[PDB]
Amino acid sequence: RLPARFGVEQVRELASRDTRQGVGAGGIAWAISELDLAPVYLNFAENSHLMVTGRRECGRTTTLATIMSEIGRLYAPGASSAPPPAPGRPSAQVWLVDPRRQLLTALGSDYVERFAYNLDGVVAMMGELAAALAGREPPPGLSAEELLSRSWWSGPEIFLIVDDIQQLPPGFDSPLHKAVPFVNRAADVGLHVIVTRTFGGWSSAGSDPMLRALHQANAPLLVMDADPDEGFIRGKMKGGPLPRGRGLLMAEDTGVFVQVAATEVRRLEHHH
Ligand SMILES: Nc1ncnc2c1ncn2[C@@H]1O[C@H](COP(=O)(O)OP(=O)(O)OP(=O)(O)O)[C@@H](O)[C@H]1O
Ligand SMILES: [Mg+2]
């Protein structure tokens, strides 16, 4: 069964030798499964997003750091000042909400288009992001012949990565409300929303429009070390105590235990 630590260098060894179908192979490799000790991916063919939750120091930030490292491996740099990508390569652009500033250097400025650490910064950044996403569709009222001619928007894959979403205001106040309309058609606008939240008060966190939209889109939910007392999370599954880095990867009614690939974060600040 699963080890207490499995490095990202280790999962990459496995990913380069994995040709399994229907698991998102060739994509972001961020964990290994309890079932077969094989890689677990962000299967963008199934879903564009990911939610991660768990109690204090379960490994939420490290999970994002591993995913970001994978983005750097699999994608050409897609920030505005980055060079044109090598032929055949997809491009990735990161929009980072990181209040505790732990993920600022997981990727260089050739990947990170915008990052925000204060509320005003988040509000401003989300406005810019929404404007870019709104442009990713054809002009209205074109003929069939016109629509056939080309792809009408161009640009890199956009990763909206948010650590510690619990620190943001909930409700309609939420700065993330401008990105909500794109969640359901994320694949068509090349959007990926990856968010973490502390497990405390999880069932009462539906009040966040982004978390609600992600649940409505049936995004994968990794429930790391957690408390059964919060009740059922998805279907008949409750959260439970787990070693650090380990989580129950939930769909709607089913789940599988995984061990998240570890990577270094110089930056870890827990406010002890
Ligand atoms: N995948 C992992 N495998 C093994 N250990 C891990 C893993 N992820 C995190 N840890 C360990 O757990 C500790 C906390 O890491 P991290 O800061 O990522 O957690 P966190 O949940 O974000 O914490 P916080 O609650 O402060 O946000 C660190 O010591 C880290 O080494
Ligand atoms: Mg953290």
| Helices and strands of the chain, counted as H and E runs | 6, 13
Residues with CB under 5 A from ligand 2 (ion): 60-61
Furthest-apart CA atoms within the chain: distance in Å: 62
In this structure, which ligand is nearest to the CA of 56?
Answer: 1
Cβ-defined contacts of 128-133 (< 8 Å, 24+): 129/95, 129/158, 129/160, 129/178, 129/179, 130/178, 130/179, 130/182, 132/158, 133/158, 133/179, 133/182, 133/189, 133/191
CA distances from 22 to 43, 132, 260 (A): 8, 31, 20
Element (H, E) at 114: strand 112-116
* 11 CA → ligand 2 middle, Å: 22
For this entry, resolution in Å reads 2.0
Q: With a 6 A CB cut-off, is 64 part of the ligand 1 pocket? A: no
Contact 156/78 with Cβ under 8 angstroms?
yes
Q: How far is the CA of 36 from the centre of ligand 2 (A)?
A: 28
Residues flagged as binding site for ATP: 54-61
CA of 264 to the centre of ligand 1 (A): 10
Residue 233, SS3 per DSSP = strand
Nearest to 113 by CA among 158, 148, 155: 158
Q: How many CB atoms lie within 10 A of CB 243?
A: 15
3-state secondary structure of 125: helix
**58 Cβ neighbours under 8 A, 6+ residues apart:** 199, 224, 225, 226, 242, 244, 245, 247
Nearest in space to 60 (alpha carbons), one of 217, 238, 239, 225: 225
**Best CA proximity match to 234, nearest among 259, 258, 211, 210:** 211
Closest-lying ligand to the alpha carbon of 224? Answer: 1
Angle at 39 between CA 38 and CA 40, to 5 degrees: 120
Residues in the chain: 272
Run of H or E including 96: strand 91-97
> How many whole angstroms from its chain centre is CA 130?
17
Q: What are phi and psi of 262, to 5 degrees?
A: -80, 140
- Spell 66-83 as b/e; 16+ CB within 10 A means b: bbbbbbbebbbbbbeebe
Pairing of strands 232-234, 191-198: unpaired
Give the orientation angle of helix 8-15 with respect to helix 60-74, to 10 degrees: 40
For CA atoms 103, 108, 110, 111, the dihedral sign is: negative
260 - beta bridge partners? 31
User: For atom 3 of ligand 1, which residue has the closest CA?
Assistant: 245
Alpha-carbon radius of gyration of the chain? 18
> Would you say the CB of residue 245 lies under 6 angstroms from ligand 1?
yes
Please tell me the distance from the alpha carbon of residue 69 to that of residue 46, in angstroms, as a whole number.
22
For residue 268, the ligand closest to its alpha carbon is: 1
Residue nearest to atom 10 of ligand 1 (CA): 59
Phi, psi of 247 (to 5 degrees): -155, 155
